[PDB]
Amino acid sequence: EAGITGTWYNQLGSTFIVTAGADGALTGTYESAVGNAESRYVLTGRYDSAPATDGSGTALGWTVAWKNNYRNAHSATTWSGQYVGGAEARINTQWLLTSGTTEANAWKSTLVGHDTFTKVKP
Amino acid sequence: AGITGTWYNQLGSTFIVTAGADGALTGTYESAVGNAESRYVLTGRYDSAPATDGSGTALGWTVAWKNNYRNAHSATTWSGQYVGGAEARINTQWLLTSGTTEANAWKSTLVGHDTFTKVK
Amino acid sequence: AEAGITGTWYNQLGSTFIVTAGADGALTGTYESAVGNAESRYVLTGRYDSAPATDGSGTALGWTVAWKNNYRNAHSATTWSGQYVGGAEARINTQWLLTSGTTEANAWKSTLVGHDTFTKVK
Amino acid sequence: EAGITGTWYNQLGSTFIVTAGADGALTGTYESAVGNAESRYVLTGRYDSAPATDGSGTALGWTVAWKNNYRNAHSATTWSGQYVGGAEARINTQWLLTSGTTEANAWKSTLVGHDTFTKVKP
Ligand SMILES: O=C(O)CCCC[C@H]1[C@H]2NC(=O)N[C@H]2C[S@@]1=O
Ligand SMILES: O=C(O)CCCC[C@H]1[C@H]2NC(=O)N[C@H]2C[S@@]1=O
Ligand SMILES: O=C(O)CCCC[C@@H]1SC[C@@H]2NC(=O)N[C@@H]21
Ligand SMILES: O=C(O)CCCC[C@@H]1SC[C@@H]2NC(=O)N[C@@H]21
């Protein structure tokens, strides 16, 4: 909720800096430790601003297009996942990284993986 | 943009989007299926300087399935590419994550693929 | 059993899937890809629901190819997970995961994801 | 032939018992700790029987159809991933669980997740 805003780090050492707005907006920057990336990229996404009463995770997702002032990878990643708060707060995601490709190469356009974000660098 | 406009997928969902000069996607999504009614806000990003060698334009966007009427406690992200020209298409794969208790997290996420066209 | 599975199938990429469905759930056959790091036929094995529902629902199944044969070794494996539907427009509708062997540093980009639809003609 | 051969457990406590044959076969049983499943199910799959020698993992995949003598969930899972040997040996996977569905429900036929296996008995 409010618990989402701030800096998060994944298992690769990437840095996810986000603000969760009152009704569901996510805005911030992403800096990847790997791949065809340097410095920060804009991200935007959405989260459930009124998660379930049973303490289920807070669903959210966000997108990075891998273009910034320094570099353009011609690709975009979406992370889809859920935030869980508490002493071991986490954002558990799966992601789809699509590169722009010709139609013939479209079958190999999309990588899939999973990132776990924590409040401390692993 | 190119990307800007009203799109429909194979399910009959409606994707109304505007592509900004800064790489932003903004608009609304209305799903023909699932735990959804009416329009939901979406935001996303696209490559605003794509390759000129015939490649598609990479993009993605998110919907959290809460609006003024309903809350599914879930979010879909679509990742894909825009292919322009006479019969422009957006081809995607998506991940739908539901918020879940710890016991149910293994089954939190559905995966699929949606193809969008501007044909009503 | 689901006798409708056994035979030759073709996907939208021009690949050929030749399979035998055993009475109690075995899939065995060969796969020839029209794309990627692949030449000639590769062994496949998998499983299917040999007593599917009779309400018109599909028959769940999946199979694996490791991309090594007598000609070539791509150091990768693909699994297709999907469902068979019979009738006049019989199809096997799948999603797949193609994992390459990688070093630990490159494991984040080990897996491609996509979808293939197999039909009895094309 | 085999590092891969053995009894493995994932983060859910599920048990994967596998034999890796000299030419690329995987056979064994799977018991899920979760879902519409009880006791053991047959699996088959394939792995790269001549992996790279540069420190890369060994690609593999396998399928379970969730029908056995006790229960039938009309579903199948495939795991695609790689085996990383040494200490601590691990098989890192992503999986697709497809249920047989009507055409109207096919959009929600397939779950996706990731399982990591080790030889450590919970
Ligand atoms: O190589 C590219 O096309 C851009 C960089 C992609 C970095 C990926 C990698 N970094 C990260 O923090 N999680 C994974 C998923 S993100 O697509
Ligand atoms: O490049 C490789 O590593 C081996 C060949 C992969 C071919 C892929 C491609 N061919 C096909 O019929 N469907 C898709 C998914 S399979 O992983
Ligand atoms: O059921 C839910 O949790 C919310 C609605 C989900 C609808 C999904 S999003 C992916 C797919 N494409 C669509 O247009 N609708 C379904
Ligand atoms: O519920 C079903 O349809 C059958 C059981 C599915 C269990 C899944 S397979 C992927 C994940 N890993 C496991 O060890 N169990 C769950």
Coordinates of C-alpha atoms and ligand atoms in Angstrom, one line a residue:
Chain A
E1 CA 0.0 0.0 0.0
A2 CA 2.1 2.8 1.5
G3 CA 4.5 -0.2 2.1
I4 CA 5.3 -0.5 -1.6
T5 CA 6.9 3.0 -2.0
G6 CA 10.6 3.1 -1.7
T7 CA 13.7 1.2 -3.0
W8 CA 13.7 -2.5 -3.6
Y9 CA 16.5 -4.9 -4.8
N10 CA 16.2 -8.2 -6.6
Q11 CA 18.3 -11.3 -6.6
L12 CA 20.4 -9.9 -9.6
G13 CA 21.2 -6.8 -7.6
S14 CA 18.9 -4.6 -9.7
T15 CA 17.4 -1.5 -8.1
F16 CA 13.6 -0.8 -8.3
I17 CA 12.7 2.7 -6.9
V18 CA 8.9 3.2 -6.8
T19 CA 6.1 5.4 -5.5
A20 CA 2.7 3.9 -5.0
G21 CA 0.0 6.6 -5.4
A22 CA -3.2 6.5 -3.4
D23 CA -5.5 5.0 -5.9
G24 CA -3.3 2.5 -7.7
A25 CA -0.5 4.3 -9.7
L26 CA 3.1 3.1 -9.7
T27 CA 5.8 5.5 -10.9
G28 CA 9.6 5.3 -10.5
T29 CA 12.8 4.1 -12.0
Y30 CA 14.5 0.8 -12.6
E31 CA 18.3 0.1 -12.9
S32 CA 19.2 -3.3 -14.1
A33 CA 22.3 -5.1 -12.9
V34 CA 22.3 -7.2 -16.1
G35 CA 21.6 -7.1 -19.8
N36 CA 21.4 -4.4 -22.4
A37 CA 20.9 -1.6 -19.9
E38 CA 22.8 1.3 -18.1
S39 CA 21.6 3.9 -15.6
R40 CA 17.9 4.4 -14.7
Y41 CA 14.8 3.8 -16.9
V42 CA 11.3 5.1 -16.4
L43 CA 8.7 2.7 -15.1
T44 CA 5.0 2.9 -14.7
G45 CA 2.5 0.4 -13.5
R46 CA -0.6 -0.3 -11.4
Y47 CA -1.3 -2.0 -8.0
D48 CA -4.4 -3.0 -6.1
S49 CA -5.0 -0.1 -3.7
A50 CA -7.4 -2.1 -1.5
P51 CA -6.1 -5.7 -1.1
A52 CA -8.1 -8.5 0.4
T53 CA -9.0 -8.5 4.0
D54 CA -7.5 -12.0 4.6
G55 CA -4.0 -10.6 4.1
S56 CA -3.4 -12.0 0.7
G57 CA -0.7 -10.3 -1.2
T58 CA -1.2 -7.0 -3.1
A59 CA -1.3 -7.6 -6.8
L60 CA 0.7 -5.2 -9.0
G61 CA 2.6 -4.9 -12.2
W62 CA 4.9 -2.5 -14.0
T63 CA 6.6 -1.9 -17.3
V64 CA 10.1 -0.7 -18.3
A65 CA 10.8 0.1 -22.0
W66 CA 14.6 -0.2 -22.2
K67 CA 15.2 3.3 -23.8
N68 CA 16.7 6.1 -21.9
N69 CA 19.0 9.0 -22.8
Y70 CA 22.0 6.8 -23.0
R71 CA 20.9 3.5 -24.5
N72 CA 18.0 1.8 -26.4
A73 CA 17.7 -2.0 -26.4
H74 CA 14.5 -2.0 -28.4
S75 CA 12.8 -4.1 -25.8
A76 CA 10.3 -3.9 -22.9
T77 CA 9.9 -5.9 -19.7
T78 CA 6.7 -6.3 -17.6
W79 CA 6.8 -7.7 -14.1
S80 CA 3.5 -9.1 -12.8
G81 CA 3.4 -10.1 -9.1
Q82 CA 2.3 -9.5 -5.6
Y83 CA 3.7 -7.4 -2.6
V84 CA 3.7 -9.1 0.9
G85 CA 4.5 -6.8 3.8
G86 CA 5.9 -7.5 7.2
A87 CA 9.3 -8.5 8.6
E88 CA 10.2 -10.3 5.5
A89 CA 8.6 -7.9 3.0
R90 CA 8.9 -9.0 -0.6
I91 CA 7.6 -8.3 -4.0
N92 CA 7.4 -11.7 -5.8
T93 CA 7.2 -11.4 -9.6
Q94 CA 7.4 -13.2 -12.9
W95 CA 8.4 -11.1 -15.9
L96 CA 8.2 -11.1 -19.7
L97 CA 11.0 -9.3 -21.6
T98 CA 9.9 -8.8 -25.3
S99 CA 12.4 -7.5 -27.8
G100 CA 11.3 -5.9 -31.1
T101 CA 11.9 -8.5 -33.8
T102 CA 11.0 -9.1 -37.4
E103 CA 7.8 -11.2 -37.8
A104 CA 9.9 -14.2 -38.8
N105 CA 11.8 -14.0 -35.5
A106 CA 8.8 -13.3 -33.3
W107 CA 8.9 -16.8 -31.9
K108 CA 12.1 -15.9 -30.0
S109 CA 11.1 -12.4 -29.0
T110 CA 10.2 -13.1 -25.4
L111 CA 12.2 -14.2 -22.4
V112 CA 10.5 -15.2 -19.2
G113 CA 11.8 -15.2 -15.6
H114 CA 11.1 -14.5 -12.0
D115 CA 12.5 -11.8 -9.8
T116 CA 12.1 -11.5 -6.0
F117 CA 12.5 -8.0 -4.6
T118 CA 13.5 -7.3 -1.0
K119 CA 14.2 -4.2 1.0
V120 CA 17.8 -5.2 1.6
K121 CA 20.4 -5.9 -1.2
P122 CA 21.0 -9.7 -1.3
Chain B
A1 CA 1.2 5.7 -32.3
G2 CA 0.5 4.0 -34.8
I3 CA -0.1 2.6 -31.3
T4 CA -2.7 5.3 -30.3
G5 CA -6.2 4.1 -30.9
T6 CA -8.9 1.6 -30.0
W7 CA -7.9 -2.1 -30.2
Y8 CA -9.7 -5.4 -29.7
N9 CA -8.3 -8.8 -28.9
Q10 CA -9.4 -12.4 -29.8
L11 CA -11.6 -12.4 -26.7
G12 CA -13.4 -9.2 -27.7
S13 CA -11.8 -7.1 -24.9
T14 CA -11.3 -3.4 -25.7
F15 CA -8.0 -1.7 -25.3
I16 CA -8.1 2.1 -25.6
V17 CA -4.7 3.6 -25.6
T18 CA -2.7 6.7 -26.2
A19 CA 1.0 6.6 -26.9
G20 CA 2.9 9.7 -25.6
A21 CA 5.9 11.3 -27.1
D22 CA 7.9 10.4 -23.9
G23 CA 7.3 6.6 -24.3
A24 CA 4.2 6.5 -22.1
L25 CA 1.1 4.4 -22.7
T26 CA -2.1 5.5 -21.0
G27 CA -5.7 4.5 -21.4
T28 CA -8.4 2.0 -20.4
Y29 CA -9.0 -1.7 -20.7
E30 CA -12.3 -3.5 -20.7
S31 CA -12.1 -7.3 -20.5
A32 CA -14.7 -9.6 -22.2
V33 CA -13.9 -12.3 -19.7
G34 CA -12.9 -12.9 -16.0
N35 CA -13.6 -11.1 -12.8
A36 CA -14.0 -7.7 -14.4
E37 CA -16.7 -5.2 -15.4
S38 CA -16.5 -1.9 -17.2
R39 CA -13.2 0.0 -17.8
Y40 CA -10.0 -0.2 -15.8
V41 CA -7.1 2.2 -15.9
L42 CA -3.9 1.1 -17.7
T43 CA -0.4 2.5 -17.9
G44 CA 2.6 1.2 -19.7
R45 CA 5.7 2.1 -21.8
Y46 CA 6.8 1.6 -25.4
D47 CA 10.0 2.1 -27.3
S48 CA 9.5 5.6 -28.8
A49 CA 12.6 5.1 -31.2
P50 CA 12.2 1.6 -32.6
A51 CA 14.5 0.0 -35.1
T52 CA 14.0 0.7 -38.8
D53 CA 15.0 -2.7 -40.0
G54 CA 11.5 -4.2 -40.1
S55 CA 11.4 -5.0 -36.4
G56 CA 8.3 -4.5 -34.2
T57 CA 8.0 -1.8 -31.5
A58 CA 8.4 -3.3 -28.0
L59 CA 5.8 -2.3 -25.4
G60 CA 4.1 -3.4 -22.3
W61 CA 1.3 -2.2 -20.0
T62 CA -0.5 -3.1 -16.8
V63 CA -4.0 -3.2 -15.5
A64 CA -4.8 -3.7 -11.8
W65 CA -8.3 -5.1 -11.7
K66 CA -9.8 -2.6 -9.3
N67 CA -12.2 0.1 -10.4
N68 CA -15.1 1.9 -8.9
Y69 CA -17.3 -1.1 -9.3
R70 CA -15.3 -4.3 -8.6
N71 CA -12.0 -5.5 -7.2
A72 CA -10.6 -8.8 -8.4
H73 CA -7.4 -8.4 -6.3
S74 CA -5.3 -9.1 -9.4
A75 CA -3.2 -7.5 -12.1
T76 CA -2.3 -8.3 -15.7
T77 CA 0.7 -7.2 -17.5
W78 CA 0.9 -7.6 -21.3
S79 CA 4.4 -7.6 -23.0
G80 CA 4.7 -7.6 -26.7
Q81 CA 5.3 -5.7 -29.9
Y82 CA 3.4 -3.4 -32.1
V83 CA 3.6 -4.3 -35.8
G84 CA 2.5 -1.3 -38.1
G85 CA 1.4 -0.9 -41.7
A86 CA -2.0 -1.5 -43.3
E87 CA -3.1 -4.3 -40.9
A88 CA -1.4 -3.1 -37.8
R89 CA -1.4 -5.6 -34.8
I90 CA -0.2 -5.7 -31.2
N91 CA 1.0 -9.2 -30.4
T92 CA 1.4 -10.0 -26.7
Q93 CA 2.0 -12.5 -24.0
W94 CA 0.5 -11.7 -20.6
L95 CA 0.9 -12.6 -16.9
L96 CA -2.2 -12.3 -14.6
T97 CA -1.2 -12.5 -11.0
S98 CA -3.8 -12.7 -8.3
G99 CA -3.1 -11.7 -4.8
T100 CA -3.0 -14.8 -2.7
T101 CA -2.3 -16.2 0.8
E102 CA 1.0 -18.0 1.2
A103 CA -0.8 -21.4 0.7
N104 CA -2.1 -20.4 -2.6
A105 CA 0.9 -18.5 -4.1
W106 CA 2.0 -21.4 -6.3
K107 CA -1.2 -20.9 -8.3
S108 CA -1.1 -17.1 -8.3
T109 CA -0.3 -16.6 -11.9
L110 CA -2.0 -17.3 -15.2
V111 CA -0.2 -16.9 -18.6
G112 CA -1.7 -16.4 -22.0
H113 CA -1.4 -14.6 -25.3
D114 CA -3.5 -11.8 -26.8
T115 CA -3.4 -10.5 -30.3
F116 CA -5.0 -7.0 -30.9
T117 CA -6.2 -5.4 -34.0
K118 CA -8.1 -2.2 -34.7
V119 CA -11.0 -4.2 -36.4
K120 CA -14.3 -3.9 -34.4
Chain C
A1 CA -7.1 -43.1 -24.2
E2 CA -7.4 -40.1 -26.6
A3 CA -6.8 -41.8 -29.9
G4 CA -7.2 -38.4 -31.7
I5 CA -3.8 -37.3 -30.6
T6 CA -1.8 -39.9 -32.5
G7 CA -0.5 -38.7 -35.8
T8 CA 1.3 -35.8 -37.5
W9 CA 0.7 -32.3 -36.5
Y10 CA 1.9 -29.0 -37.9
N11 CA 2.3 -25.6 -36.2
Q12 CA 2.2 -22.0 -37.4
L13 CA 6.0 -21.9 -37.8
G14 CA 6.0 -24.9 -40.3
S15 CA 7.3 -27.4 -37.7
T16 CA 6.2 -31.1 -37.7
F17 CA 5.2 -32.9 -34.5
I18 CA 4.8 -36.7 -34.9
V19 CA 3.4 -38.5 -31.9
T20 CA 1.9 -41.7 -30.6
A21 CA -0.5 -41.6 -27.6
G22 CA -0.4 -44.8 -25.6
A23 CA -3.4 -46.2 -23.9
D24 CA -2.5 -45.1 -20.4
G25 CA -1.0 -41.7 -21.0
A26 CA 2.4 -42.0 -22.8
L27 CA 3.4 -39.7 -25.6
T28 CA 6.4 -40.7 -27.7
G29 CA 7.5 -39.4 -31.1
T30 CA 9.7 -36.9 -33.0
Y31 CA 9.8 -33.2 -33.5
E32 CA 11.3 -31.2 -36.4
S33 CA 11.5 -27.5 -36.0
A34 CA 11.4 -25.1 -38.9
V35 CA 13.2 -22.5 -36.8
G36 CA 16.0 -22.1 -34.3
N37 CA 19.1 -24.2 -33.7
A38 CA 17.7 -27.4 -35.0
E39 CA 18.2 -29.8 -37.9
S40 CA 16.2 -33.0 -38.8
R41 CA 14.2 -34.9 -36.1
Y42 CA 14.5 -35.0 -32.4
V43 CA 13.1 -37.4 -29.8
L44 CA 10.2 -36.3 -27.7
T45 CA 8.4 -37.8 -24.8
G46 CA 5.5 -36.6 -22.7
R47 CA 2.2 -37.5 -21.0
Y48 CA -1.4 -36.8 -21.6
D49 CA -4.7 -37.3 -19.7
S50 CA -5.9 -40.7 -20.9
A51 CA -9.4 -40.3 -19.4
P52 CA -10.3 -36.7 -20.2
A53 CA -13.7 -35.2 -19.4
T54 CA -16.4 -35.9 -22.0
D55 CA -18.1 -32.4 -21.8
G56 CA -16.2 -31.0 -24.8
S57 CA -13.2 -29.7 -22.7
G58 CA -9.7 -30.3 -24.1
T59 CA -7.4 -33.2 -23.1
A60 CA -4.4 -31.8 -21.1
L61 CA -1.0 -33.0 -22.3
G62 CA 2.7 -31.9 -22.5
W63 CA 5.9 -33.0 -24.0
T64 CA 9.7 -32.3 -24.0
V65 CA 12.4 -32.2 -26.6
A66 CA 16.1 -31.9 -25.7
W67 CA 17.7 -30.3 -28.7
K68 CA 20.4 -33.0 -29.2
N69 CA 20.4 -35.5 -32.0
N70 CA 22.9 -37.2 -34.2
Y71 CA 23.5 -34.0 -36.1
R72 CA 23.6 -31.2 -33.6
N73 CA 23.4 -30.2 -30.0
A74 CA 21.9 -26.8 -29.1
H75 CA 22.3 -27.4 -25.3
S76 CA 18.6 -26.6 -24.7
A77 CA 15.3 -28.2 -24.1
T78 CA 11.7 -27.2 -24.8
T79 CA 8.5 -28.2 -23.0
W80 CA 5.1 -27.7 -24.6
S81 CA 2.1 -27.6 -22.1
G82 CA -1.3 -27.5 -23.7
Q83 CA -4.6 -29.2 -24.5
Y84 CA -5.9 -31.3 -27.5
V85 CA -9.3 -30.5 -28.9
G86 CA -10.9 -32.9 -31.4
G87 CA -13.6 -32.4 -33.9
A88 CA -13.7 -30.8 -37.3
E89 CA -11.1 -28.1 -36.4
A90 CA -8.9 -30.4 -34.2
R91 CA -6.0 -28.6 -32.6
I92 CA -3.3 -28.9 -30.0
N93 CA -3.1 -25.5 -28.4
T94 CA 0.2 -25.0 -26.4
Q95 CA 2.4 -22.6 -24.5
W96 CA 6.1 -23.5 -24.4
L97 CA 9.3 -22.9 -22.4
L98 CA 12.7 -23.2 -24.2
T99 CA 15.5 -23.3 -21.6
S100 CA 19.2 -23.1 -22.8
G101 CA 22.0 -24.4 -20.5
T102 CA 23.7 -21.2 -19.3
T103 CA 26.3 -20.1 -16.8
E104 CA 24.9 -18.8 -13.5
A105 CA 25.6 -15.2 -14.6
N106 CA 23.5 -15.7 -17.7
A107 CA 20.7 -17.8 -16.1
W108 CA 18.3 -14.8 -16.0
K109 CA 18.1 -15.0 -19.8
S110 CA 18.0 -18.8 -20.1
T111 CA 14.3 -19.2 -21.0
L112 CA 12.2 -18.2 -23.9
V113 CA 8.3 -18.4 -23.8
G114 CA 5.9 -18.7 -26.6
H115 CA 2.8 -20.4 -27.9
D116 CA 2.3 -22.9 -30.7
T117 CA -1.0 -24.1 -32.2
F118 CA -0.8 -27.4 -34.0
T119 CA -3.3 -28.5 -36.6
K120 CA -3.9 -31.6 -38.6
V121 CA -3.4 -29.7 -42.0
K122 CA -0.8 -27.1 -43.0
Chain D
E1 CA 23.9 -40.4 -16.0
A2 CA 23.8 -39.1 -13.3
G3 CA 24.1 -36.1 -11.3
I4 CA 20.4 -35.7 -12.4
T5 CA 19.4 -39.2 -11.2
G6 CA 18.1 -39.1 -7.6
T7 CA 15.4 -37.9 -5.3
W8 CA 14.7 -34.1 -5.4
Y9 CA 12.5 -31.8 -3.4
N10 CA 11.2 -28.4 -4.4
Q11 CA 10.3 -25.3 -2.3
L12 CA 6.8 -26.6 -1.9
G13 CA 8.0 -29.9 -0.4
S14 CA 7.0 -31.9 -3.6
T15 CA 9.1 -35.0 -4.4
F16 CA 10.6 -35.5 -7.9
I17 CA 12.2 -39.0 -8.3
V18 CA 14.1 -39.3 -11.5
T19 CA 16.4 -41.4 -13.5
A20 CA 18.5 -39.9 -16.2
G21 CA 19.2 -42.5 -19.0
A22 CA 22.5 -42.5 -21.0
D23 CA 20.9 -41.2 -24.2
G24 CA 18.7 -38.4 -22.9
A25 CA 15.7 -40.0 -21.2
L26 CA 14.1 -38.9 -18.0
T27 CA 11.7 -41.3 -16.2
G28 CA 10.3 -41.3 -12.7
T29 CA 7.6 -40.2 -10.4
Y30 CA 6.3 -36.9 -9.1
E31 CA 4.4 -36.2 -5.9
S32 CA 3.0 -32.7 -5.4
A33 CA 2.6 -31.3 -2.0
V34 CA -0.1 -29.0 -3.4
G35 CA -3.0 -28.8 -5.8
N36 CA -5.5 -31.4 -7.0
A37 CA -3.1 -34.2 -6.6
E38 CA -2.3 -37.1 -4.3
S39 CA 0.5 -39.7 -4.1
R40 CA 2.8 -40.3 -7.1
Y41 CA 2.3 -39.7 -10.8
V42 CA 4.3 -40.9 -13.7
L43 CA 6.7 -38.4 -15.4
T44 CA 8.8 -38.6 -18.6
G45 CA 11.1 -36.1 -20.1
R46 CA 14.4 -35.5 -21.8
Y47 CA 17.7 -33.9 -20.9
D48 CA 20.9 -32.9 -22.8
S49 CA 23.2 -35.9 -22.4
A50 CA 26.3 -34.1 -23.6
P51 CA 26.2 -30.6 -21.9
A52 CA 28.7 -27.9 -22.6
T53 CA 31.8 -28.1 -20.5
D54 CA 32.2 -24.3 -20.0
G55 CA 30.3 -24.1 -16.6
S56 CA 26.9 -24.0 -18.2
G57 CA 24.0 -26.0 -16.7
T58 CA 22.4 -29.0 -18.4
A59 CA 19.1 -28.3 -20.0
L60 CA 16.2 -30.6 -19.3
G61 CA 12.4 -30.8 -19.1
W62 CA 9.7 -33.2 -18.1
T63 CA 5.9 -33.7 -18.0
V64 CA 3.3 -35.0 -15.5
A65 CA -0.3 -35.6 -16.5
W66 CA -2.2 -35.4 -13.3
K67 CA -4.0 -38.8 -13.6
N68 CA -3.1 -41.7 -11.4
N69 CA -5.1 -44.5 -9.8
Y70 CA -6.5 -42.3 -7.1
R71 CA -7.4 -39.0 -8.8
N72 CA -7.6 -37.2 -12.2
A73 CA -7.3 -33.4 -12.3
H74 CA -7.6 -33.2 -16.1
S75 CA -4.4 -31.2 -16.2
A76 CA -0.7 -31.5 -17.1
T77 CA 2.4 -29.7 -16.0
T78 CA 5.7 -29.3 -17.8
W79 CA 8.9 -28.1 -16.1
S80 CA 11.6 -26.7 -18.3
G81 CA 14.9 -25.8 -16.8
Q82 CA 18.6 -26.7 -16.1
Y83 CA 20.5 -28.8 -13.7
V84 CA 23.5 -27.1 -12.1
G85 CA 25.8 -29.7 -10.6
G86 CA 28.5 -29.5 -7.8
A87 CA 27.6 -28.3 -4.3
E88 CA 24.7 -27.7 -3.8
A89 CA 23.3 -29.5 -6.8
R90 CA 20.1 -27.9 -8.1
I91 CA 17.5 -28.1 -10.8
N92 CA 16.1 -24.6 -11.6
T93 CA 12.8 -24.6 -13.5
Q94 CA 9.9 -22.7 -14.8
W95 CA 6.6 -24.6 -15.4
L96 CA 3.4 -24.5 -17.2
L97 CA 0.3 -26.2 -15.8
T98 CA -2.4 -26.5 -18.4
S99 CA -6.0 -27.7 -17.5
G100 CA -8.4 -29.1 -20.0
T101 CA -11.0 -26.5 -20.5
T102 CA -13.9 -25.5 -22.7
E103 CA -13.0 -23.1 -25.5
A104 CA -14.7 -20.2 -23.6
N105 CA -12.4 -20.9 -20.6
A106 CA -9.2 -21.5 -22.6
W107 CA -7.9 -18.0 -21.8
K108 CA -7.5 -19.2 -18.1
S109 CA -6.2 -22.7 -18.9
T110 CA -2.5 -22.2 -18.0
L111 CA -0.8 -21.4 -14.7
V112 CA 2.9 -20.5 -14.7
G113 CA 5.4 -20.7 -11.9
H114 CA 8.9 -21.6 -11.0
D115 CA 10.3 -24.4 -8.9
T116 CA 13.8 -25.0 -7.6
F117 CA 14.8 -28.5 -6.6
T118 CA 17.6 -29.7 -4.3
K119 CA 18.4 -33.1 -2.9
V120 CA 17.7 -31.9 0.6
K121 CA 14.7 -33.8 2.3
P122 CA 12.5 -31.3 4.1
Ligands
LIG1 O1 18.6 -6.7 -22.2 C1 17.5 -5.9 -22.3 O2 16.9 -6.1 -23.4 C2 17.2 -4.9 -21.3 C3 17.6 -5.3 -19.9 C4 16.7 -6.4 -19.4 C5 17.1 -6.7 -17.9 C6 16.2 -7.9 -17.4 C7 16.7 -8.5 -16.1 N1 17.1 -7.5 -15.0 C8 16.3 -7.6 -14.0 O3 16.5 -6.9 -13.0 N2 15.4 -8.6 -14.1 C9 15.5 -9.2 -15.4 C10 14.2 -8.9 -16.2 S1 14.5 -7.4 -17.0 O4 14.0 -7.7 -18.4
LIG2 O1 17.1 -23.1 -30.9 C1 17.1 -24.0 -30.1 O2 17.6 -24.0 -29.0 C2 16.4 -25.3 -30.5 C3 15.2 -25.1 -31.4 C4 14.0 -24.4 -30.7 C5 12.8 -24.3 -31.6 C6 11.6 -23.6 -31.0 C7 10.5 -23.2 -32.0 N1 10.1 -24.2 -33.0 C8 8.8 -24.6 -32.8 O3 8.3 -25.5 -33.6 N2 8.3 -24.0 -31.8 C9 9.2 -23.1 -31.1 C10 9.5 -23.5 -29.6 S1 10.8 -24.6 -29.7 O4 11.5 -24.3 -28.5
LIG3 O1 -10.2 -12.3 -13.6 C1 -9.4 -11.4 -13.2 O2 -8.7 -11.5 -12.3 C2 -9.5 -10.0 -13.9 C3 -9.8 -10.1 -15.4 C4 -8.7 -10.7 -16.2 C5 -9.0 -10.8 -17.7 C6 -7.8 -11.4 -18.5 S1 -6.4 -10.3 -18.6 C7 -5.7 -11.5 -19.8 C8 -6.8 -11.9 -20.6 N1 -7.0 -10.9 -21.8 C9 -8.2 -10.3 -21.6 O3 -8.6 -9.4 -22.5 N2 -8.9 -10.7 -20.6 C10 -8.1 -11.8 -19.9
LIG4 O1 -3.8 -29.0 -9.3 C1 -3.5 -29.7 -10.3 O2 -4.1 -29.5 -11.5 C2 -2.5 -30.8 -10.3 C3 -1.4 -30.6 -9.3 C4 -0.5 -29.4 -9.8 C5 0.6 -29.2 -8.8 C6 1.6 -28.0 -9.3 S1 2.6 -28.5 -10.7 C7 3.6 -27.0 -10.5 C8 3.7 -26.8 -9.0 N1 4.9 -27.5 -8.4 C9 4.5 -28.5 -7.7 O3 5.4 -29.2 -7.1 N2 3.2 -28.5 -7.5 C10 2.5 -27.5 -8.2

